Ligand binder design. Structure first.
Ligand SMILES: COc1cc(F)cc(N2[C@H](C)CN(S(=O)(=O)N3CCCN(CC4CCCCC4)CCCN(S(=O)(=O)c4ccc(N(C)C)cc4)C[C@H](C)C3)C[C@H]2C)c1
Lengths: 61, 31, 448
């Protein structure tokens, strides 16, 4: 009731993973570069916006 | 009915921020 | 949609662009929306007496893209609640050119909910006693939050109707996590103590310690293993978890589909391992979060009860009850004393992400039956297999893919929590899986 369904799920997952299209070096590098660029854009824009508004909020509030 | 564009949305978003700043500044120089 | 129709037209709306917006103006509008979001996130509300009380909704500030004591206090609540109430009304059969009425009533109800939320947020006393604040100040705060929610809805529609990339929910949530990581890396804040001056940012503290301390080895050791401020072993773990999530999200079961209506277009239908892209993470984080805020409000009132003592026992971190067994352990080091808590947490995180994924594939119309119907309606057939066997070949993949992408995403969240990575596990997963969506949009628009 528990051993058989779990074993079947494990086998299905293993077959799915061994049949998926795993990334290679070039695809991994491309995705890593894109994620790094997006993270840099969003995080650093937010960081600069927060830096600008610390003195401003200190003055007004 | 009302169908604004992206430019009116940006203008309203900037004017709301500006109004909040004016309220804060008025409070600071009135208190 | 007819009785309330008078009230569903007055609110503003966004015009669909006449021509396809180029990938330059779309990025420009996305950047403008992001800048407006951030600036409103850094602007405090007017009328606040003292933001010195513990945040009642600290736990949902990440999922909701909120920032306490500022204009973006509700975050993406106007977007989320409007959609949720629309789906609830549709499912309950209360509600059914009808698209314009639906999209008007959605925004009309997502502002009533925004006002109700702006009233619940004030009576909590996080802005001070409402009696001391006064009716005028409470009304002014409610109006500011109403206008902020209207701006949130307008920006989301700006991003969705074609003027920008993605949606507000994804962009704002990813931004508040990327900004949090970058701030914990480069914080100018200096938490002084008996030892001396040290920056709250890991890299800035590394430079400051390598400059001002004679014992350079004990400066590198400190800047790498601080237990009071973000160190560099928490920023290296962040990069490692980013890399692992990037590798595991690139998995896909490429199905060779082949159209039979217009013969000539051979293609690939990718069934990603992360079938439900971070939806299990959003659902699990939303459950626990809205349950800590409830077991935390019910731990003040009705204190010392039994239902309260079992739902959660707070100190503000949980120390018992249901809330304790849902909270991540304090890294792998805090597992030795309580092994059963760690076992229950690792089990709950996997068995909740899996359940949420396999339920979302049936609720969001991505089940094998729905994909088979799409294939039949578009003439698509699997190349090697037959035409009537598409449902079987999709049922042998999609359910297992959803379940295992729930287990994998839950395990990545657990690993990130156990490695002490900055941004948490939910945040690092919600950041990577959302930046990947924008990467997919980028490649799609650049190839089309
Ligand atoms: C200390 O004070 C307390 C104490 C307490 F005992 C309870 C509370 N209540 C209050 C009501 C305030 N609210 S609330 O207004 O902040 N609200 C949550 C509301 C709950 N329901 C149902 C809603 C309301 C019904 C009609 C549509 C929907 C959860 C709805 C969704 N959620 S979600 O799950 O977080 C979530 C889900 C998905 C995402 N994506 C990124 C896609 C993000 C978040 C969001 C709501 C907007 C937030 C808190 C609640 C604890 C506050």
């Amino acid at each position: 009731q528990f051993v058989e369904p779990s074993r079947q799920f494990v086998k299905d997952s293993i077959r799915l993973v061994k049949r998926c299209t795993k990334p290679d070096r070039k695809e991994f590098q491309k995705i890593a570069m894109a994620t790094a660029i997006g993270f840099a854009i969003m995080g650093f824009i937010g960081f600069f916006v927060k830096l600008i508004h610390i003195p401003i909020n200190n003055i007004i509030v | 009915g009302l169908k604004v564009g992206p430019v009116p949305v940006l203008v309203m978003s900037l004017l709301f921020i500006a109004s909040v700043f004016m309220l804060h500044i008025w409070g600071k120089y009135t208190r | 949609l007819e009785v309330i129709k008078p009230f569903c037209v007055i609110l503003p709306e966004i015009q669909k662009p006449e021509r396809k917006i180029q990938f330059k103006e779309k990025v420009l509008w996305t950047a403008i929306t992001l800048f407006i979001f951030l600036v409103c996130c850094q602007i405090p509300l007017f009328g606040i007496m003292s933001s010195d009380s513990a945040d009642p909704f600290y736990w949902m500030r990440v999922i909701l893209a909120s920032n306490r004591g500022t204009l973006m206090e509700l975050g993406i609540s106007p977007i989320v609640t409007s959609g949720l109430i629309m789906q609830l009304l549709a499912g309950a059969k209360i509600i059914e050119k009808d698209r314009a009425l639906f999209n008007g009533a959605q925004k009309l109800f997502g502002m009533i909910i925004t006002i109700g939320q702006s009233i619940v947020y004030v009576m909590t006393g996080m802005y001070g006693d409402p009696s001391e604040m006064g009716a005028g100040i409470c009304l002014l705060i409610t109006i500011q939050l109403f206008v902020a929610g209207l701006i949130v809805l307008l920006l989301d529609e700006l991003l969705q109707k074609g003027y920008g990339l993605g949606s507000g929910i994804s962009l704002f949530i990813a931004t508040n996590i990327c900004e949090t990581i970058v701030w914990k890396a480069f914080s100018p804040t200096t938490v002084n103590t008996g030892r001396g001056m040290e920056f709250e940012g890991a890299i800035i503290a590394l430079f400051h310690l390598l400059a001002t301390r004679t014992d350079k080895v004990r400066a590198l050791r400190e800047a790498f293993y601080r237990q009071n401020l973000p160190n560099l072993m928490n920023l290296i773990a962040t990069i490692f978890v980013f890399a692992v999530v990037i590798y595991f999200q690139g998995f896909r079961y490429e199905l060779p589909i082949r159209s039979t209506k217009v013969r000539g277009q051979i293609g690939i239908y990718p069934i990603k391992l992360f079938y439900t892209s971070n939806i299990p993470i959003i659902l699990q984080s939303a459950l626990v979060s809205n349950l800590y805020v409830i077991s935390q409000m019910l731990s003040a009132r009705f204190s010392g009860n039994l239902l309260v003592s079992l739902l959660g026992t707070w100190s503000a971190y949980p120390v018992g009850g249901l809330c304790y067994y849902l909270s991540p352990p304090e890294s792998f080091g805090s597992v030795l004393e309580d092994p059963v808590h760690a076992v229950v947490y690792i089990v709950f995180m996997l068995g909740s992400c899996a359940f949420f994924s396999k339920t979302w594939i049936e609720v969001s119309g991505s089940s094998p039956r729905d994909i088979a119907k799409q294939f039949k309606d578009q003439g698509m057939v699997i190349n090697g297999k037959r035409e009537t066997s598409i449902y079987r070949e999709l049922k042998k993949i999609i359910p297992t893919a959803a379940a295992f992408g729930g287990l994998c995403i839950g395990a990545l969240s657990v690993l990130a929590d156990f490695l002490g990575a900055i941004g948490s596990g939910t945040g690092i997963l919600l950041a990577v899986t959302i930046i990947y969506q924008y990467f997919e949009i980028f490649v799609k628009e650049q190839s089309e």
